[PDB]
């Protein structure tokens, strides 16, 4: 039970903590960093016609 305990007491606390920790660390950099002027001209692919 010492392990039955620690095996649970650790896996859940640890593995998930680190996750959600970065789940809110990485997903945080983007949200802030990535800011574009959407209404800005984009790549100039050609446009045909007949």
């Amino acid at each position: 039970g010492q392990e039955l305990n620690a095996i649970k007491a650790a896996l859940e606390a640890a593995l998930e903590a680190r996750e959600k920790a970065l789940e809110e660390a990485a997903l945080k950099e983007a949200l802030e960093r990535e800011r574009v002027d959407v209404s800005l001209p984009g790549a100039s692919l050609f446009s045909g016609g007949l």
């Binding site: 789940e23 997903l27 983007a30 949200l31 960093r33 990535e34 800011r35 574009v36 002027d37 959407v38 209404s39 800005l40 001209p41 984009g42 790549a43 100039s44 692919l45 050609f46 446009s47 045909g48 016609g49």
Partner: protein, 780 residues
Amino acid sequence: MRVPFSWLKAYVPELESPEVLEERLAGLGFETDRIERVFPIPRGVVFARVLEAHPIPGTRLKRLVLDAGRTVEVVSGAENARKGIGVALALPGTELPGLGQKVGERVIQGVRSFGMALSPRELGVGEYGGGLLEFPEDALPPGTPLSEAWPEEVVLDLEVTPNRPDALGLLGLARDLHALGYALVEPEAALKAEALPLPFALKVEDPEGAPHFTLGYAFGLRVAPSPLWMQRALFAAGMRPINNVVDVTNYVMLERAQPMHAFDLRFVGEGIAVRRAREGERLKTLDGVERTLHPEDLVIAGWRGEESFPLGLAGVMGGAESEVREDTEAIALEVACFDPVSIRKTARRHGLRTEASHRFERGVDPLGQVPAQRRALSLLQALAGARVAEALLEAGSPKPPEAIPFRPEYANRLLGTSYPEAEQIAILKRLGCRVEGEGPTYRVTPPSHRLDLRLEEDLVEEVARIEGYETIPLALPAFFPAPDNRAVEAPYRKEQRLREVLSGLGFQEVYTYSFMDPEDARRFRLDPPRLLLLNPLAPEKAALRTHLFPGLVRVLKENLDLDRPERALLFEVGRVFREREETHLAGLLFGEGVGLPWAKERLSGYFLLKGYLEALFARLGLAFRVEAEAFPFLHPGVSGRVLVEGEEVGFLGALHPEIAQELELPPVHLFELRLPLPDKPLAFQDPSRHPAAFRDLAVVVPAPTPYGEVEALVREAAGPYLESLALFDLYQGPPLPEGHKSLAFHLRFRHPKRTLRDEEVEEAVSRVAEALRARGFGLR
């Protein structure tokens, strides 16, 4: 429906072969799913006569002494094994299909068993294996090979469409083959009745459920097994013989599609009462199944004095208790027409599907009961040596079919054929109609059994088929369509072109189930579906999609998991649901991007898509621009709405990071407009042949401002003579204030008739600088 060739050939004597019959039934309106030979019985199986059945002490087995030409014994654990019946004796050295290893002399519990007495499964005539076959003890001379009296049969598997319940009876089916010119042989129920009173009374209490209900009376019955021809016939049709009486009921049923059932009078009481089950009442049907009854079930009950008990689930399946057995001498024969809906309901309510209900659901001859009673009563008299009574017990007086106005002129008009009147009237008369007519429009009244003939169009169909659809000639109609039909196909050619155009640029088309996972409503942050299902293939497919991307994206994940597309530009046009069904176009970009297979320099992401998209509507000659808008499913940093020809119709951005993270997906971009796209009529406009005065000019602007507002303003005040515009560079650098950026535009002016003087352009380039100031922008 299983159709035993030879059984049919008994009514239709001159049939060519199982093959031709299928060709024939084909043109008649019935296709055969399969054909198959059925009773391969080795020379090793003979008929034998159970002289005596001796119980082997200590066992549950029996030593049978059989007259198999000479005398032999056999051991058998079959309950039904008794003295005085015939059996299918498989002699030692016989190869049985149903049990493959070679039968032989074997000692069992002390007796030299000389081969074994077969069972339905063991002979290969039926799936039953809980007893031996039971032949009439005098069936054949002891020892004669069984095949000699049980030839290989051929069974066709016919699809019988709902408009032909008359066809769930071979004699009915036969009537169609007749119309093609085949001789028809109807059995002549040869009754020898006796004018005497019936020991029971009828009391139909729900004439609504039993529109027509007749009871027969056969007594002094001698129950025994059926002759071989009967047993053989029933088996080929997918049914298992059970005796004298019970078998004739099933035989007739299959023959003329009229379910019937012999109730044993010992149980009938005073009389038979056709009523509804008293909410509560219990009944144990033939299948051994003990059931409870919903007060809506139409029951066939009996009453005794002041009592009333159920005897059978009317039209569906008889009751276990009153079934006829060997010790029965008199019966009450049920032959009725039951309300199709009542049966349907009940049948399913109890999860039952019988040959009986199946027919009563589809439809029974409203006036074919009585003829049926005689056919059964006759046969009972001939195989059970019964003494049939003379009077029946009727309840209900159905009205024969009405006349149908039939003009062979129209038949030929509607078919594009020119069948001579004569052939038509002739045919109709072969199918049993009464053609009381003089011409040109006859009074055709069909046979009580044709439920599928009410209209004059129904009749014309009868000619085409009996005459052969292959006789209707080919043709092509020529006419000018009514005016409100001109251009009705614009909406279509429009969208189609669309797809075609997309497929041009580089988009890969994709179709995705209209279904939506209610969960994705949260998973992609959308509003829950308004239209859901009451019977989803799976909760995952429980609702109706409100967007096209959730799917476009999912098909992506699914791709990257089976294969790992390095990149992917996709699109889908489909119907979305929400308040109203509406067509949508969806796109999706993802991966490295567009560039050089080598040189790391790639061109991609948001602006790559807006790239194609601008390039897209460019092709369609339609106004397009994006204007940042919050969309619960797109990176707040890259998310706006799409504006086609000025009107908003969708969105364009990158999938919300938090989301990609859940579906464990990389970054991704998309858009989803709504169709049909705006329609700009074209106004040609001669382009001036006079040089376009063009000048550059940067505009220092605050970092938060969107390029959209800038240009909108420049072009606006830039004057009419302004030809082009363009943004050749965006600079957010050193020689500029804090939180600022410069937009350098490449303008270009031009006059229609003559060249322009720089004094004019300035008076314009200026007007652009003035409003650029009145607003709040600089001008490097």
